[PDB]
Design an enzyme around this catalytic site. Structure first.
Site, PDB file in Angstrom:
ATOM      1  N   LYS A   1      -2.022  -6.694   6.320  1.00  0.00           N
ATOM      2  CA  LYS A   1      -0.658  -7.128   6.199  1.00  0.00           C
ATOM      3  C   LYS A   1       0.077  -6.153   6.907  1.00  0.00           C
TER       4      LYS A   1
ATOM      5  N   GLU B   1       6.540   2.787   0.306  1.00  0.00           N
ATOM      6  CA  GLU B   1       5.732   2.761   1.472  1.00  0.00           C
ATOM      7  C   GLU B   1       4.987   4.023   1.407  1.00  0.00           C
ATOM      8  N   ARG B   2       3.894   4.148   2.171  1.00  0.00           N
ATOM      9  CA  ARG B   2       3.155   5.349   2.160  1.00  0.00           C
ATOM     10  C   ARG B   2       3.879   6.105   3.143  1.00  0.00           C
TER      11      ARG B   2
END
Lengths: 487, 60, 466, 66
Positions: free
Chosen positions: C154, C180-181
């Site tokens: 994704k 989010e990372r």
């Protein structure tokens, strides 16, 4: 004044422990410091658990809680017809102040026995599959079940749009007030939707109660009840009102949520249990009443949009037990392109015949069967591949009918027309045709019958029934015209 | 103009062979039916304007 | 006004301000908390105590400690100077190019614009993906929600989408990294640096980054959504723009909410949820849309918890979706990219007319074909083949091509694919599958439709073989 | 337009105080002017664009024949 005023005992999360107002009427709509209404739902002795109607970021504590001293009413009228309001009657359309400035308690109880009357009016949707396979009555409460926009709504639309002509007809027995209670259907959804109805201006006899996704939960919860008084009104005023509650599924969600926040329970599936009751009391208020009540009706089309066909699902079980059928719409078929996508095995009207023209009844009766049987040889031996030659024909017949019960994306009809194509197939003039072209046959066929046999149709339309004239003509037409359609 | 009254015996129509046109006839029929369906619909009159209304109401 | 830390149970900060109780939503700045510790009031609990949320660390919070009300709800700078900046939730850089300074600040909680300036209808955006455009024709300014499993390409896809789109874009873009990372943002950072459309001769880049990572406490993650919204609504409406709003991943927001619910003393609804989960949806989602005041093309990465969609959270979501984008892990597993579950991915504007019904119809045959073919799968699963029916045998194969034909390697992620990916405009698409409908390939190697863009090239891919 | 006379004296005269001036109707208000100019152009963009103080006369055409 500030003596049957109260200070917000505690607030947060729109759950107002309300100090004061200690003479409060149960379910009194209360009046805010922030203007706002709330419901003194909960009379605890030491507080009033007040559901805050609307936003509470505004709010702060000890804030003055005023009686509105009123049990909720909603403005009522026919001046809701051609209006998008929120449930309090607030134009969100920006159509300005409604003519409905009479008000009516949103809770007004469900009819008596004697007051009620059974149905025997049909009604229709302009959808062959529907009117045929689920012939429509008036004064309903029966489940519409299917999943979302697919033009889930299409189904409804063609119906509403279909009532347009009927509203262009007369009586509350052709003319119909459509009530669209939109529960949690986003501004967009609605935005679009409304935009459609308006375009069809089938909106004209039609309320759109618009509770978009944004809206506070009780409000959305309420929206139907709001509608409910108004539709009973119509009913009692002879008017036959149609409410499409789309949907109570969401309503429950709100309702529980509300409960939970009140700490008021999360029964089975997290919903406290009288949400059935909620609706029962709500929906009983949809009926076809006797003439003392103008004979009117409030036809209830509740909608439940299922998550994954989950129906033993509490509210669905519940709802099933009230509803007198469910109209299951079937997705696979959808993907197949079959829109409407039905499974009519899982669509049922116990009602059946009270809900229809003879016309249709005559051609349809058999058709249902012909498909049934068709399905069956797909099924005993769960193969679409056959078990007997006879049926290799019959299957053809079934298949033909299959082409026929479909309904165009964004398309309603009226009964004689509907019968027109149906007769053609039922009495077969098009198994001598390939199944895909059947619909094609209709385009021409229909434009032909419309052209010519509006005469004839004039008769069928007259009889509510296929007559000897009509038939005689039909037998001939269908054959000839069909012959013309082909050759 | 209005409508032209030509009746078409479609039986006879396709058959023709002035050979540069037989193929054309087969296509021209269907080319027709496209045109036929189109005209047969088109709404005969469009509306026109309540000039007085907008005369007031346009205030450029 | 000042509050006392009265109870700290993590970043759920129970504050008693006895100095009156400013709004529910009044944003607080903690005193004795040099490092700007925002608490947002959540409840007026009574007792001049509010339950507030620290979004942040709860170091050295003596119970009593003074907390000073920021006197409004949370306000953030909004201004063009944010683009190309990685702004955190708190309006501050994480671009680390100095402060993301703007002219105007905005309280980030806000109204969902009224229905009437909302444009009631929209138009399909083109994504450059056959599969998408064809099957789920998503709309410009719509909210497209990318349901998709964990890291299921994704992330890859969205990036590719950025790639396909953001470039081409006329208005600008926002990425709101919700949970989010740090890494992906990094990755993205560099990609963006790289792309240079996060051009740094621009703090007015083509894309603004607002990040509210996982490592933040939920309150922050919860809030980054509002923050981002607020900026973007500003660019859309205020800066006119067609904003593309990349949100990855709202789920993580949702989660942030849910996470607090418990220790918001609330009953955290099913599975722990929020009862208000829905209102939560309205309250952000209804704020983002397309008005007449521009478009916020709203790209929501949606983690589909346990790829459970029946899962009420996603269950809700669909409703909100102009475009529902369902990535099929199942397909994905087949290694396939486009990995979609397109019989789950929709666009309401997938409905004939709108999109050119041919276009659609060509799809309808396919959609069908595959679906029927899907139907067979139980039968086949045991039974395989040899007592079934031929036409189906054809479809099977055809489907099998079709299946493959949807597949397209990654153009960006040649690093991932090896392959060069592809990009397909409409015609090859419409035709592509349609051609398969014509079954023109039914002696051409079936898998050869795999990881292709144009059907032509696919035809070619069959060919080199034979 | 509406009521209470001491309060409305403050406001109803202030309805028309605005109207009781018309070059900047006791305030047109520079902000009103600015956002007006914004929305009036933006409105124009949101509109169809073929000048709104001009008459769109006719066009002509010639259809496919073989």
């Amino acid at each position: 004044d500030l003596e049957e005023t109260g200070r917000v005992l505690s607030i947060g999360d729109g759950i107002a422990r309300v100090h004061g107002l200690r003479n409060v009427q149960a379910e009194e709509m209360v009046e805010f410091s922030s203007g706002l209404k709330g419901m003194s739902l909960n009379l605890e002795p030491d507080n009033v658990g007040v559901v805050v109607f609307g936003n509470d970021k505004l709010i702060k504590e000890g804030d003055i809680v005023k009686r509105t001293g009123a049990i909720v009413d909603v403005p009522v009228g026919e001046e809701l017809l051609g209006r998008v309001v929120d449930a309090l009657g607030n134009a969100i359309d920006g159509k300005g102040p409604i003519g409905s400035k009479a008000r009516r308690r949103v809770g007004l109880k469900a009819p008596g026995i004697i007051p009620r009357i059974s149905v025997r009016e049909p009604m229709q949707t302009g959808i062959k599959a529907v009117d045929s396979l689920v012939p429509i009555g008036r004064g309903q409460r029966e489940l519409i079940i299917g999943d979302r926009q697919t033009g889930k709504t299409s189904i409804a639309i063609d119906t509403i749009i279909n009532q347009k002509r009927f509203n262009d007809g007369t009586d509350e027995k052709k003319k119909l007030y459509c009530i669209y209670v939109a529960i949690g259907q986003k501004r967009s959804t609605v935005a679009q939707l409304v935009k459609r109805l308006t375009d069809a201006d089938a909106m004209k006899y039609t309320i759109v109660v618009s509770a978009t996704a944004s809206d506070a939960a009780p409000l959305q919860y309420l929206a139907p009840y709001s509608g409910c008084s108004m539709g009973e009104y119509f009913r009692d005023n002879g008017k036959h009102a149609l409410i499409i509650y789309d949907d109570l599924s969401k309503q429950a969600v709100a309702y529980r949520q509300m409960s939970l926040l009140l700490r008021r329970p999360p029964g089975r599936e997290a919903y406290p249990g009288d949400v059935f009751y909620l609706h029962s009391r709500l929906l009983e208020r949809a009926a076809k009443m006797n003439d003392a009540f103008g004979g009117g009706s409030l036809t209830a089309l509740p909608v439940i949009e299922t998550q994954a066909g989950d129906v033993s699902a509490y509210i669905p079980t519940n709802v099933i037990s009230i509803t007198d059928g469910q109209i299951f719409l079937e997705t696979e078929l959808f993907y197949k392109g079959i829109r409407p996508a039905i499974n009519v095995g899982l669509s049922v009207s116990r009602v059946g015949s009270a809900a229809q023209t003879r016309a249709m009844k005559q051609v349809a009766g058999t058709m249902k069967l012909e498909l049934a049987q068709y399905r069956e040889v797909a099924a005993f031996a769960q193969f679409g591949s056959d078990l007997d030659a006879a049926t290799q024909q019959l299957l053809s017949r079934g298949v033909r009918l299959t082409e026929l019960l479909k309904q165009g994306q964004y398309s309603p009809m009226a009964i004689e027309e509907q019968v027109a194509v149906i007769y053609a197939g039922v009495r077969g003039y098009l198994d001598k045709l390939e199944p895909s072209k059947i619909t094609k046959f209709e385009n021409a066929f229909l434009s032909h019958v419309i052209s010519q046999h509006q005469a004839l149709l004039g008769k069928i339309r007259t009889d509510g029934k296929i007559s000897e004239e009509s038939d005689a003509k039909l037998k001939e037409i269908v054959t000839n015209f069909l012959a013309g359609f082909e050759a | 103009r209005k409508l032209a009254l030509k009746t078409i015996d479609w039986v006879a129509f396709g058959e023709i062979i002035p050979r540069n046109q037989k193929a054309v006839a087969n296509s021209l029929k269907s080319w027709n039916e496209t045109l036929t369906s189109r005209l047969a619909t088109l709404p005969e009159k469009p509306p026109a304007i309540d000039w007085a209304y907008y005369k007031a109401n346009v205030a450029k | 006004t000042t509050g006392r830390i009265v109870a700290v149970i993590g970043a759920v900060v129970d504050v008693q301000f006895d100095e009156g109780l400013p709004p529910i939503l009044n944003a607080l700045e903690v005193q004795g908390r040099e490092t700007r510790l925002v608490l947002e009031v959540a409840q007026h609990l009574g007792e001049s105590t509010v339950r507030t949320i620290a979004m942040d660390g709860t170091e050295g919070l003596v119970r009593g400690q003074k907390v000073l009300d920021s006197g409004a709800p949370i306000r953030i700078p909004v201004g063009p100077e944010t683009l190309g900046r990685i702004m955190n939730v708190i309006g501050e850089p994480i671009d680390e190019r100095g402060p993301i300074k703007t002219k105007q600040f905005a309280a980030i909680h806000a109204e969902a614009p009224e229905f009437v300036e909302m444009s009631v209808e929209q138009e399909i955006l083109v994504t450059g993906i056959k599969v998408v455009d064809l099957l789920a024709p998503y709309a410009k300014g719509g909210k497209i929600g990318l349901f998709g499993g964990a890291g299921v390409g994704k992330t890859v896809l969205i990036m590719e989408l950025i790639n396909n789109v953001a470039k081409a874009h006329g208005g600008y873009s926002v990425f709101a990294g919700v949970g989010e990372r740090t890494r992906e943002g990094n990755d993205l950072y560099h990609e963006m640096i790289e792309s240079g459309v996060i051009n740094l001769k621009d703090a007015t880049s083509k894309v603004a980054l607002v990040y509210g990572q996982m490592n933040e406490p939920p309150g922050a993650r919860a809030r980054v959504a509002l923050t981002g919204l607020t900026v973007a609504e500003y660019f859309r409406d205020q800066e006119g723009q067609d904003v593309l709003l990349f949100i990855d991943n709202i789920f993580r927001f949702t989660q942030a909410g849910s996470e607090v619910s418990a220790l918001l003393g609330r009953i955290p609804s099913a599975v722990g949820y929020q009862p208000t989960l829905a209102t939560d949806m309205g309250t952000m989602q209804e704020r983002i849309t397309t008005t007449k005041k521009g478009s916020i093309t709203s790209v929501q990465a949606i983690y589909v918890p346990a790829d459970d969609l029946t899962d009420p959270a996603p269950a809700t979501t669909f409703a909100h979706l102009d475009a529902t984008t369902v990535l099929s892990r199942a397909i994905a597993e087949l290694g396939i990219y486009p990995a979609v579950d397109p019989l789950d991915s929709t666009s309401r504007i997938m409905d004939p007319n709108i999109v050119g019904s041919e276009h659609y119809d060509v799809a309808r045959g396919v959609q069908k074909i595959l679906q029927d073919y899907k139907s067979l799968q139980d039968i086949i699963a045991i039974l395989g083949m040899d007592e079934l029916s031929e036409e189906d045998k054809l479809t099977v194969s055809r489907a099998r091509k079709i299946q493959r034909f949807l597949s397209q390697p990654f153009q960006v992620a040649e690093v991932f694919t090896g392959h060069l990916g592809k990009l397909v405009p409409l015609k090859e698409t419409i035709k592509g599958f349609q051609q398969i409908l014509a079954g023109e390939y039914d002696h051409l190697p079936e898998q050869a439709f795999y990881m292709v863009g144009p059907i032509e090239e696919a035809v070619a891919k069959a060919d080199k073989l034979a | 337009l509406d009521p209470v006379q001491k309060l409305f004296v403050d406001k109803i005269r202030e309805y028309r105080t605005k109207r009781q001036t018309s070059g900047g109707p006791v305030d047109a208000g520079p902000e009103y002017q600015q956002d007006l100019d914004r929305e009036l152009f933006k409105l124009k963009q949101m509109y169809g664009k073929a000048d709104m103080n001009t008459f769109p006369n006719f066009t002509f055409e010639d259809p496919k024949f073989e």
